[PDB]
Design a binder for this molecule. Structure first.
Ligand SMILES: Cc1[nH]c(/C=C2\C(=O)Nc3ccc(F)cc32)c(C)c1C(=O)NCCN1CCCC1
Ligand SMILES: Cc1[nH]c(/C=C2\C(=O)Nc3ccc(F)cc32)c(C)c1C(=O)NCCN1CCCC1
Lengths: 681, 688
């Protein structure tokens, strides 16, 4: 708290207080730990020589380095007051001392366009053609190696560039580690005037014009993309320039000029040997409605690639092949055309259209760029990237006024998918597919809740099936961060219960019908007790922060018919069931209501089968599980083949005859030691 | 073959056009892709001669192509007015539209065709008409723009002042988004043309507190453009609100300070801009903007609080560093926030290293390459084709600056190597290793799906495998990957590295990976602790030939110990095993020939404790056949827990572990004998 007010005093520029505290013993080489700023560093930055003098009076080191390795000498280059540089030079071991990224005081004078300061340092031994030596991580990615001229050229300081080349013997064709010269730095400056002057200077000194910058672009290409005919003329004056150089994308300087609607620039390029075998220029000019340029390319005319690209979607394959072939302007990384041929579906605002994002096929959901709906969709999607059962999110792109959200393209909606597979199974077979779809949804919605989000509009058109029969949740425009109202999670759970019934009924019942039913009507329409119990627990959940849904994945609804039969057999093999030990812990657990279908169960079984098993079966639950265990073990023997014919497949037998059995046993043993007999879930 | 009907019109030789008309050829024929008529194409090329010849052979001048454009409206762009006068006698309405709402008048406004614009004006063209578009694009508030808005955007100064002063153009007409011509004007790259147009629109009363994209006002747009002049012209209005904010919450002054523009900052303060929209002095100080810091100091951020840190990381290993990176100030590289400093460094690479980052405010790992790097290009190519692969590290995106490719990936806790070290103590010496199975089955799926996607990894090792906070395994690092279609045989080296990884993970990391790569295939197999592992690794070193991986997920290596025991019990309960019917199909599968020699279960009745062997005896005596051992296992399984057999239960312990240790080859033997038979039914259900 003493050095603290020394620091505070220097920023307010209260000079007496600075003297007082140095007299009082305040450390002038105190470095704040976040970024390493010294009071001498901060003094040079604010340009107050009075403060620079008083601190130096009290032994403050002028080559003390902050986090980036900069000394208050190097910071003086940035300030560009020469009398500060005078005051510190007597103490500085090397005038070419650099920071961790290789910046010297002379470079910093070049960067900040400090003419008076760069002269001073020039006379005092500064290296003019110094390249920046940086840390090893940065050099292995070929960063660094820039020079004072490149910095001056990029920031457009014409004053500084002139002096460097003429007065200071600056190398014009010095390169950085990536291979760039000052010419390419010069051509990236937004101001046309300053760019024009600097390129002229650099050219006359012998700056190479066949060099490669970002995107493998040449100087000429950069000048064309800038739309500046002047810089094109200057670079065309050199004859050893390669006019038919191509960037990373395979585009040539002429091609871009035609594409960019630049008549003057196009003609001038042709009249300097630019080949017209780079692309179909007249189609491009025709598309741009430049009649005059079409004529020119035609009057100069004397007399296409191969289409590699293949879509992975088979439903959308032919339309994507078309969209890939046509020309469209890019919206960032997105290629899209708003036409019914490329439309997937209709929405509350904008529609779903096929698109290409980074040349990958996607579904593009459109919103107005201001839309609250568009904001919640993107916010929820960007938190869901680890949720395997949520549709993959590529990215969002905006133009003037439309937010495009790009998503993984799926084959079918849940509804369509159920329709296509509706004739696959015979009427009364076990429905594995309903389990897979629903367990996927439970995980999807459960993970979304752990993410802090609730969907708020779960229905079969928001659920998509990919080429490999995976189920994915989509459409988060009405989603909410559920901490805002934790009780609206129940709406997700209710829609899940309707989706349970919807999928179990193979889509024969519409979702609209099901939403118009009451809870009791939904339970009645359920074909079995497992489904009934599950839907019940979704409408009457417990209380959980996205733990609830994963728990219900252990519910016997998601147990196969073999696993259900296996659990009843395993329970019926407990010692105390076979010995009918009625004080036992197991039988006390199955102790007890509403007349179950297995009360008086020995009467409901075929009398031949009942007779032969007896080799004393009472109407207890314990005795029925023993019955199931025994039959399970001996059903396949030669001795029992008539029994086997009457029973058929045993799992289905007991379940049809006693529909509440599995659920009853599950409820009695669910939080007990005998849970171990349940299938692994 | 009549493809000259329109090849002739584009070559503009009229000799072949007139003669083509009387040679079995139509004039209103529309090519199906875009709908271009020869009359459409004639007007676009500005040929008075071709439009004349075709129209005196009946060609309809209100014929539409795909966007609903007529040859009339497309005359609006070309601007030639005597083609407009040749076609007007044949057109019902001069305000006719294309599907996007565009008139012949606005296309004249867009292309700055002054002489064409006034022709249409005095022929009744509506100057204040807004575009009526398709219902899709109106529901996202697109369309509704004016001829003035088009003139303003394209910078045509001539056209703007004629519209305002000759043609009674509404200056504050809005589009469906809520924009006026002022905001269209300020998006124009040319400073001069922008200056002139803004002046005109301002003097006629164009609202200056409008909102465009991003909820930016005209003033904010002028500051972001770095143009002092447009700023002064805007603040000449007194009704303007200088403290209007954008959607990001920032105001015109704050941006000016952030952007290093003391000119514009000072002028803004001198016109009522509040100085508590941000800590301006800290911002100017960080920009080394000495004179600006002095200025703001004389007046600044005394009454301003920066929002309290309402952001929490999900990673616990990297939590502390991400909290710091969220707090500090950094410039954005597109959607990426990163700082290259050792505090935020995750690992070293051969190019650039791995650093913590924030991408769309999500924590990520940022792998850096040279923007030219071939290895950087293969990494993103393979990542972009793996977005559906659940067991590949999630790919957020790539960002480039001047000269560095940043690849942003899901942040994981630990490397496979680190993870096996931390959990080395978790299992008891002789208990089942579930974790080895989960890790390996995830890798099998990962590499399998990567192959279906057309890629091979080519450098599988434990440093390229990451574990997340929920113990899920993810494959990463595809800088050396290849499209295997060029050379389909090189996926075998992925399957070899998988073989090594199997042994590596089963040994809980105690044998190094370098050791294992220096071993031969036979040495690796002999180092395996059980026959399941041995068999699996064998099938990875000798695979082929393609989707071996998916099939191997059914291998008994991935069967739990309960399931292994369950299938031995279920095979042992077959009728023909209990009756010892040796002619049966099952026992002909199991124990055919002269005998079952050279296996730990030859004379198996001798290897079992004599108490338990005795008490199991109720022919009629367990023989040294495999059939009788599975019967043995079935019988014990059913009665082991009964009160009468408590002592047997204590000698045996957990029965699955018992039989596997005393007969290590048993499970694999039964598997091999029954694997493509009907008795496959007894195997556990595996992955679909
Ligand atoms: C309402 C609907 N949504 C979708 C699809 C998506 C949807 O709503 N969101 C999506 C996000 C990504 C993606 F790949 C697809 C969708 C479809 C294909 C449909 C649909 O079914 N469209 C009409 C064709 N069928 C359904 C009724 C009879 C006609
Ligand atoms: C070699 C290595 N790679 C990583 C991490 C990743 C890695 O190599 N690739 C990744 C991609 C995504 C991601 F989230 C993480 C990585 C770490 C943390 C390490 C590591 O172990 N760093 C500390 C080095 N210490 C640990 C043992 C002695 C060296």
């Amino acid at each position: 708290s003493l050095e603290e007010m020394l620091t505070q005093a220097v920023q307010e520029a209260d000079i007496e207080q600075v003297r007082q505290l140095l007299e009082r013993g305040a450390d002038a080489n105190f470095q704040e730990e976040e970024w390493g700023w010294s009071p001498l560093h901060s003094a040079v930055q604010m340009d107050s020589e009075d403060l620079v003098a008083l601190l130096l009076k009290h032994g403050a080191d002028p080559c003390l380095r902050k986090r980036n390795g900069a000394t208050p000498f190097i910071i003086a280059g940035i300030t560009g007051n020469v009398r500060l540089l005078q005051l510190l030079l007597p103490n500085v071991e090397d005038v070419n001392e650099c920071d961790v990224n290789g910046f010297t005081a002379f470079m910093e004078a070049a960067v900040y366009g400090r003419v008076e300061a760069l002269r001073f340092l020039y006379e005092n031994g500064a290296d003019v053609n110094m390249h920046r030596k940086t840390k090893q991580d940065q050099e292995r990615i070929r960063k660094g190696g820039a020079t004072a001229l490149m910095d001056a050229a990029e920031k457009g300081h014409v004053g500084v560039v002139t002096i460097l080349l003429h007065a200071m013997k600056a190398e014009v064709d010095a390169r950085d580690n990536m291979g760039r010269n000052a010419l390419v730095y010069a051509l990236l400056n937004p101001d046309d005037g300053k760019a024009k002057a600097i390129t002229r200077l650099l050219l006359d000194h012998g700056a190479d014009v066949n060099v490669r910058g970002e995107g493998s672009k040449t100087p000429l290409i950069l000048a064309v993309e800038r739309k500046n005919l002047d810089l094109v003329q200057m670079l065309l004056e050199q004859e050893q320039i390669e006019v038919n150089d191509t960037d990373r994308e395979g585009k040539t300087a002429l091609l871009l000029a035609v594409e960019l609607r630049l008549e003057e620039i196009a003609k001038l390029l042709c009249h300097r040997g630019a080949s017209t075998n780079c692309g179909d220029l007249v189609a491009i000019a025709r598309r741009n409605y430049d009649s005059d340029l079409v004529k020119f390319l035609r009057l100069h005319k004397a007399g296409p690639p191969a289409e590699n690209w293949k879509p992975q979607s088979s439903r959308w394959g032919e339309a994507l092949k078309h969209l890939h072939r046509i020309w469209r302007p890019m919206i960032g990384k997105l290629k899209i055309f708003i036409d019914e041929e490329y439309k997937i579906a209709d929405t509350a605002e904008g529609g779903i259209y096929l698109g290409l994002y980074e040349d990958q096929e996607v579904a593009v959901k459109r919103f107005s760029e201001g839309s609250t709906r568009g904001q919640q969709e993107v916010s929820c999607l960007q938190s869901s990237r680890a949720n395997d059962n949520v549709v993959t999110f590529y990215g969002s792109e905006s133009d003037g006024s439309c937010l495009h959200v790009c998503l993984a393209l799926c084959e079918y909606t849940l509804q369509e998918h159920l329709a296509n597979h509706r004739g696959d199974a015979v009427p009364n077979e076990e429905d594995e597919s309903a389990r897979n779809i629903l367990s996927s949804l439970f995980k999807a919605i459960g993970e979304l809740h752990r993410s802090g989000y609730s969907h708020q509009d779960l229905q079969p058109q928001n659920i998509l099936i990919d080429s490999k029969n995976g189920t994915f949740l989509a459409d988060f425009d009405k989603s909410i961060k559920w901490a805002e109202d934790p009780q609206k999670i129940k709406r997700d759970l209710e829609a899940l219960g309707l989706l349970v019934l919807y999928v179990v009924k193979k889509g024969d019942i519409s979702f609209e019908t099901l939403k118009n039913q009451s809870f009791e009507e939904v339970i009645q329409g359920s074909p079995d007790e497992e489904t009934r119990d599950l839907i019940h627990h979704l409408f009457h959940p417990g209380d959980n922060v996205e733990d609830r849904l994963s728990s219900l994945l252990a519910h016997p609804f998601f147990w196969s018919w073999e696993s259900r039969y296996r659990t009843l057999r395993d329970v019926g093999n407990e010692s105390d069931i076979k010995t009918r030990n009625q004080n036992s812990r197991i039988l006390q657990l199955l102790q007890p209501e509403l007349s179950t279908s297995f009360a008086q169960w020995t009467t409901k079984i075929d009398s031949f089968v009942m007779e032969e098993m007896n080799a004393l079966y009472q109407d207890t639950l314990g005795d029925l599980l023993k019955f199931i265990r025994n039959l399970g073990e001996h059903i396949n023997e030669q001795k029992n083949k008539k029994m086997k014919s009457i029973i058929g497949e045993p799992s289905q037998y007991f379940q049809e005859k006693f529909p509440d059995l599995v659920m009853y046993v599950y409820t009695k043993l669910q939080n007990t030691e005998y849970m171990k007999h349940f299938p692994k879930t």
